[PDB]
Amino acid sequence: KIMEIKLIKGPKGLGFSIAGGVGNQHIPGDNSIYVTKIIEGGAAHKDGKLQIGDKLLAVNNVCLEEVTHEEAVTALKNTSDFVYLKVAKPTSMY
Amino acid sequence: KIMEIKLIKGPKGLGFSIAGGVGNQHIPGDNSIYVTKIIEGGAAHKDGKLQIGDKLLAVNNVCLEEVTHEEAVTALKNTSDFVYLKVAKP
Amino acid sequence: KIMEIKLIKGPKGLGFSIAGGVGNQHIPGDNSIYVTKIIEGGAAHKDGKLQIGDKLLAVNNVCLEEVTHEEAVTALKNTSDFVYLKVAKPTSMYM
Amino acid sequence: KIMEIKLIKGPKGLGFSIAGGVGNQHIPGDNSIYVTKIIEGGAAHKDGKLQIGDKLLAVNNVCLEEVTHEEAVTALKNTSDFVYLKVAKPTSMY
Amino acid sequence: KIMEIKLIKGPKGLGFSIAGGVGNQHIPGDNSIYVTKIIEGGAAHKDGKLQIGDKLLAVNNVCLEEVTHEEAVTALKNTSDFVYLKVAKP
Amino acid sequence: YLVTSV
């Protein structure tokens, strides 16, 4: 379920796209922020750990649960160069 | 976009399924109520006008824009035999 | 026409295989993702709607149009047990 | 039931003939395109997978279900060197 | 001179082996990628055109001249099933 | 083992 990903921000930024947010539900009934694209060459790609479908819970102690999409975009844009991403990975039964 | 569908509730009811609503978005960013299924034999089917993908705007002029799923279900089942559906066609 | 399929994973996942993607065309001149195999007794098979050769449009609202094969595999694997597939369905012009 | 076939076109083309279509039913009440001949020594023949009585479902990403004979022919002659076909295999000689 | 060989990749791949590359010369002085084996029963065998000793110039618009062994291997494996080879015969 | 096959 939970993993912690540490990134050094690239000159292009963190190099990933997000969807989700309150009133912008990526999955019906779910307000969470999800990773939808990892951009080639970017910080998240080079590190190799973040994946499409990952849910973002926090960036640097700023909570991403039950926020709007616009808030999430602002919280991610507005970090320093050293980034701690708390993420939840989907799990199965098997 | 908007057309009116008048229906007479069958023994089985209106005979279509709905998804959507505030807090249960069928399409991201969209709160509307959408028809997801037309049940064979049922009144909606026999009439023919309602299609999977139609957005329900109202029932008996009870407004279905910006409501919860449960409110939409409640509205639909509290109808009489005669039903006036306001729908938007994509 | 777009068909939505809801699958619940079994012990062996969703029970289908895919081909395609940018740089890995399944059909010439087309980067799209396609179902190539549906495994006997698996979740896709038991639901009954998905077919070999179906173009996948999105999984859990992640768009599978103009993505690489690796992106599509991850988008399908990195999911919970409840998966929403959007699939393109051909319809008749009548003529 | 459904088979995917990938072919390289020969100097003479795909090396099969078709019948059927809307307005041109090969079988009463059925508008589908049917393979009626595999040309000896042609591309379909050498590949081995296509067979007489196969229902054509698509050529490349052109759907061939409920098209006219003219639309199927056009779409089949409209191919370059590499060709994808999608077919339904018959259940009975009939 | 140059020959074009078109192949449909099988479940086992193209069915040939290669040697050569920058840093791994098959012939002293020569960085080219060469076919060293045609695999019994494979797609290259069935087609019949590709032969041992053939120099590979390109695969699907990817240049194979003055590349490393690893680059050539990666270009030959990361292709779609539709394989176009440009080849120089001795 | 020594052969690189594609």
Residue numbers in the entry:
A (entry chain D), D (entry chain A): 316 to 409
B (entry chain E), E (entry chain B): 316 to 405
C (entry chain C): 316 to 410
F (entry chain F): 2838 to 2843
Which lines from the publication concern this structure?
The human Discs Large 1/Synapse Associated Protein 97 (here referred to as DLG1) protein is a member of the membrane-associated guanylate kinase (MAGUK) family, a protein family that has been identified at sites of cell-cell contacts in different organisms including humans. The human tumor suppressor Adenomatous Polyposis Coli (APC) is a 2,843-residue protein. The second PDZ domain of DLG1 (residues 315–410, referred to as PDZ2 hereafter) has been reported to bind to APC, while neither the first PDZ domain (residues 220–310, PDZ1) nor the third PDZ domain (residues 462–550, PDZ3) of DLG1 has been reported to show substantial APC-binding activity. In addition, we determined the crystal structure of the PDZ1 domain in complex with the C-terminal 11 residues of APC (APC-C11) as well as the crystal structure of the PDZ2 domain in complex with APC-C11.
Compared to the PDZ1/APC complex, the interaction between PDZ2 and APC seems to be weaker because of the low occupancy of APC molecules. In the structure of the PDZ2/APC-C11 complex, the β1/β2 loop moves slightly away from the α2 helix, whereas this movement of the β1/β2 loop is not observed in the PDZ1/APC-C11 complex. This movement may be a result of crystal packing, since similar movement can also be found in the free PDZ2 molecules in the same asymmetry unit.
